[PDB]
Amino acid sequence: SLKQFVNASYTDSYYKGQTALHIAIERRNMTLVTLLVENGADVQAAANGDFFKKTKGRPGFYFGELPLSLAACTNQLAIVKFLLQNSWQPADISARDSVGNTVLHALVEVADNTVDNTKFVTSMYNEILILGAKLHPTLKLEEITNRKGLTPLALAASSGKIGVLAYILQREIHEPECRHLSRKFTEWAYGPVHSSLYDLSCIDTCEKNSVLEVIAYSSSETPNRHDMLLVEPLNRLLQDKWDRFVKRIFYFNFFVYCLYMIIFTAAAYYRPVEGLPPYKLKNTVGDYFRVTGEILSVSGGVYFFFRGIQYFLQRRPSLKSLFVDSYSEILFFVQSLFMLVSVVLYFSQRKEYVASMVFSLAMGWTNMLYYTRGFQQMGIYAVMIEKMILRDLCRFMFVYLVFLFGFSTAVVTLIEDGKYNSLYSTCLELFKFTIGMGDLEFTENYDFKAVFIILLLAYVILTYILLLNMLIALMGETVNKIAQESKNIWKLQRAITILDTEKSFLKCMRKAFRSGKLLQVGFTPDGKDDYRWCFRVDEVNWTTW
Amino acid sequence: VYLVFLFGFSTAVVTLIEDGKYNSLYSTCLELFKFTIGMGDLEFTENYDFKAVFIILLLAYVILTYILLLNMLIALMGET
Amino acid sequence: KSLFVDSYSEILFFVQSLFMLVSVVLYFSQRKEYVASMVFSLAMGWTNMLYYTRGFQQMGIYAVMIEKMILRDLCRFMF
Amino acid sequence: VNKIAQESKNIWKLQRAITILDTEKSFLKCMRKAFRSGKLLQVGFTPDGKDDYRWCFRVDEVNWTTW
Amino acid sequence: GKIGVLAYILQREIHEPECRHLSRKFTEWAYGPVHSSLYDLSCIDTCEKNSVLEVIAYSSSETPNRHDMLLVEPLNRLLQ
Numbered sequence A: 001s002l003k004q005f006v007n008a009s010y011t012d013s014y015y016k017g018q019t020a021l022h023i024a025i026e027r028r029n030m031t032l033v034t035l036l037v038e039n040g041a042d043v044q045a046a047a048n049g050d051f052f053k054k055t056k057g058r059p060g061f062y063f064g065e066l067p068l069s070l071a072a073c074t075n076q077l078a079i080v081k082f083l084l085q086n087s088w089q090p091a092d093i094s095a096r097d098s099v100g101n102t103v104l105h106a107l108v109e110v111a112d113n114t115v116d117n118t119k120f121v122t123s124m125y126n127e128i129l130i131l132g133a134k135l136h137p138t139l140k141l142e143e144i145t146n147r148k149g150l151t152p153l154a155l156a157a158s159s160g161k162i163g164v165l166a167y168i169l170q171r172e173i174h175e176p177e178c179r180h181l182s183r184k185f186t187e188w189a190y191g192p193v194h195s196s197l198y199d200l201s202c203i204d205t206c207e208k209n210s211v212l213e214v215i216a217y218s219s220s221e222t223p224n225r226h227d228m229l230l231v232e233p234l235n236r237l238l239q240d241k242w243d244r245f246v247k248r249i250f251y252f253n254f255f256v257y258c259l260y261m262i263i264f265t266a267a268a269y270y271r272p273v274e275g276l277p278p279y280k281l282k283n284t285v286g287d288y289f290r291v292t293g294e295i296l297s298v299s300g301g302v303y304f305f306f307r308g309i310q311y312f313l314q315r316r317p318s319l320k321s322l323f324v325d326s327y328s329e330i331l332f333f334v335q336s337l338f339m340l341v342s343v344v345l346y347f348s349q350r351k352e353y354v355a356s357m358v359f360s361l362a363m364g365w366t367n368m369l370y371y372t373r374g375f376q377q378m379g380i381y382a383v384m385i386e387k388m389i390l391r392d393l394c395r396f397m398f399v400y401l402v403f404l405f406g407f408s409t410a411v412v413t414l415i416e417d418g419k420y421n422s423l424y425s426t427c428l429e430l431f432k433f434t435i436g437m438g439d440l441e442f443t444e445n446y447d448f449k450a451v452f453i454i455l456l457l458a459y460v461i462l463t464y465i466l467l468l469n470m471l472i473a474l475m476g477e478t479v480n481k482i483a484q485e486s487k488n489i490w491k492l493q494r495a496i497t498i499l500d501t502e503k504s505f506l507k508c509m510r511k512a513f514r515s516g517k518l519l520q521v522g523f524t525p526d527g528k529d530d531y532r533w534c535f536r537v538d539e540v541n542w543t544t545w
Numbered sequence B: 001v002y003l004v005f006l007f008g009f010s011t012a013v014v015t016l017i018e019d020g021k022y023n024s025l026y027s028t029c030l031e032l033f034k035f036t037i038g039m040g041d042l043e044f045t046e047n048y049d050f051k052a053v054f055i056i057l058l059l060a061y062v063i064l065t066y067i068l069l070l071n072m073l074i075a076l077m078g079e080t
Numbered sequence C: 001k002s003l004f005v006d007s008y009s010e011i012l013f014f015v016q017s018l019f020m021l022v023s024v025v026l027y028f029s030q031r032k033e034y035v036a037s038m039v040f041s042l043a044m045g046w047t048n049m050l051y052y053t054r055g056f057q058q059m060g061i062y063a064v065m066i067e068k069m070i071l072r073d074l075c076r077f078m079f
Numbered sequence D: 001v002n003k004i005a006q007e008s009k010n011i012w013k014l015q016r017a018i019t020i021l022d023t024e025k026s027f028l029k030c031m032r033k034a035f036r037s038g039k040l041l042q043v044g045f046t047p048d049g050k051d052d053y054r055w056c057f058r059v060d061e062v063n064w065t066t067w
Numbered sequence E: 001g002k003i004g005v006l007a008y009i010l011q012r013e014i015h016e017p018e019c020r021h022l023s024r025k026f027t028e029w030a031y032g033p034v035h036s037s038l039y040d041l042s043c044i045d046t047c048e049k050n051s052v053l054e055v056i057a058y059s060s061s062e063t064p065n066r067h068d069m070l071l072v073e074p075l076n077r078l079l080q
């Protein structure tokens, strides 16, 4: 017999499932592939060994485990065609690997956004779609989800393969019986002006993996998550949503937060000065206003506390994403914690509630900067502040604190039985040099005046003259390199705001779902018409008349 | 941005201070602004409880405005 | 010349050790000036903590830039 | 600072190299695991009939052109 | 500090019979786009006296490219 011989395959766990057809495809040998398929080789054989998985800690090459995906992933179009439409055994274009990935999922996987890789991966994606429609008009490959529930578009969005996404979202196919696979259509074109229509299926809303939701709620490890929202339909859609729906709601929330902080400010400012809270309410107008302000302040704290919980549960950040991103959410949550601890101490009859309350109050005002997103100038400014705090201020503060503590310990050792003679006071006196208030003769309680003055001059040169001016130089370097990155992060922050606004929505309004339900093709594989909620974009071009 | 930070920390500090000389938004705002021109006293009052909280607030203000924001302003004017 | 134009860190650690040893000698020679040496060791010791910022990508670059600033711009400016 | 970015990267790498060398020379435990990369047979055909084992270092690379 | 010649030598590969053994870079397997090179490491990691890493790292500061030579592929990957 031949059926057992031709289909023999490796049994070891490292190369498990690899057979002769895989080898022939790998070696780019068309004749051997043809011969093996002719002799009854199984075109569905899954090479699922450890070598054929992602497995970043070991060598390997994941391609989707199937001969069709192997041919596709290696830029062999002829073999793809042959495998799909040979006489003896056509391949199952919709087959799935152990991960649930199809050929198209694999093509997304191998993409890495380089020009030469991206060009052919996009081309192979296109050709596979054409052949799928011609072989199986009733099949919808792009709607098949892997074991993680991701469609190829969702996988491209989450993995950050900007090239493939940029191809898919404006894919247009100009021929009969493949028009319906298009996502970008041209409705009319009068002079140089022409009105394109983008599909917006699974961009605006879907079951789970809307493209906007996938990009915005990325795990911060996606490579190009800042750059992907520059892909044409997405940016124009976000701007439209902002202007039509969300600009007013965001401004309203900003106004409300302003009022809340004014109330909190007034309530804290006029606190009573007797000891031992809680304080008996007096039957007078001013005290009624005061207690009203206190109640509203605590209520707002509770609101932000529960909002922070809802954010944590919805995003489930994995204990690094909880901190390396979602800066603003953590800060708002910490404000709410300080408010709540203030309440608890207030009723537990401790004056230390004041210590918590002010930390809330100060923090509350600084979180006003959260609302500088949604302004092109100020949002960029606030983003740059955040990046400064995270990079340059942290590095500087480590080095500065090493120098400060070193010279502080030296000076306090040299000082003997004086007023300062302690790490705390000496640290304050040395820090005062940084703010331009160093006495430079703050004590005489020593021997060896020369040693003391040498130490202080060394400190002053190293921190005041060297380090601070170096910090200014470094921040100057930084802003020169984070202008455009700041623009992209601002756009991303506004996108997140838009998504959260649509999710909250507070009025059960369906006007959030924009762009109108238009007829694109009117000719699906069956006789029905397709309405696909297109988004209209008008363009003008002075070439290609 | 500076006025947001200034008013936030002024309101915090003036809340923490109790029945002292300053004890007002005007005097405290002036006293915190004095840090920007390199004249911050850093011990301008003792009329409080919780010295540690007061010092933490002032050092936070100083870092955020004097060290971070002014140097950032110089960087941005350089870019502009 | 190579003893000074490079091996910056090695010189600094050696000088810390010299200050410690002079501190010991003065301490047992019944001179109070040992304190003067000890603090110079102590201060210097803490600053030599920056030696270990190599082996961290973003911090080691920062420490190297400090060294280059000290050698070029701070020296010319101080003259 | 605008001119010593890349130079700083190279000097950082060199300083880490110095650290690595000094560490392997001190080593404090008489451990031979410091000598890495495994003794592989490269060619197996020297000018004589003997095989050559040359302690190679393995580096994997991917290229999407030149198929 | 002759970075050019060094960069040539360390990844020298000769594709013909009876000169394979002179190579220092070899290709073991290449499956798809993925391929596994082997660099010799004789006289680089360790040797009698003049290991390449020791020679570069302990340069006299007057070698022109002492910073740049460790960017050559096998050396940087080995150090990492």
Ligand SMILES: C=C(C)[C@]12C[C@@H](C)[C@@]34O[C@](Cc5ccccc5)(O[C@@H]1[C@@H]3C=C(COC(=O)Cc1ccc(O)c(OC)c1)C[C@]1(O)C(=O)C(C)=C[C@@H]41)O2
Binding pocket: A327, A328, A329, A330, A331, A332, A334, A359, A362, A363, A366, A367, A368, A369, A370, A382, A383, A385, A386, A389, B059, B060, B063, B064
């Ligand atoms: C990064 C963390 C979460 C942080 C949380 C609190 C404690 C915070 O202290 C810091 C540590 C610190 C302390 C003092 C100076 C700088 C940094 O910085 C921030 C954090 C530091 C900030 C920096 O200012 C901002 O971040 C405002 C802001 C900017 C951009 C935003 O997108 C934003 O979203 C809400 C908020 C302000 C403080 O909350 C503040 O006003 C007080 C009293 C302390 C600051 O910890």
Ligand SMILES: C=C(C)[C@]12C[C@@H](C)[C@@]34O[C@](Cc5ccccc5)(O[C@@H]1[C@@H]3C=C(COC(=O)Cc1ccc(O)c(OC)c1)C[C@]1(O)C(=O)C(C)=C[C@@H]41)O2
Binding pocket: A457, A458, A461, A462, C008, C009, C010, C011, C012, C013, C015, C040, C043, C044, C047, C048, C049, C050, C051, C063, C064, C066, C067, C070
């Ligand atoms: C360059 C020489 C060897 C030097 C040796 C001593 C005396 C030193 O004074 C200097 C002269 C000086 C004095 C005051 C301010 C700047 C410079 O600078 C360094 C040297 C200057 C330094 C500068 O800070 C550093 O070098 C820390 C450091 C950074 C990077 C490194 O790779 C490093 O390797 C250990 C150390 C700190 C001092 O040792 C210090 O803390 C005291 C008390 C004096 C500084 O002489």
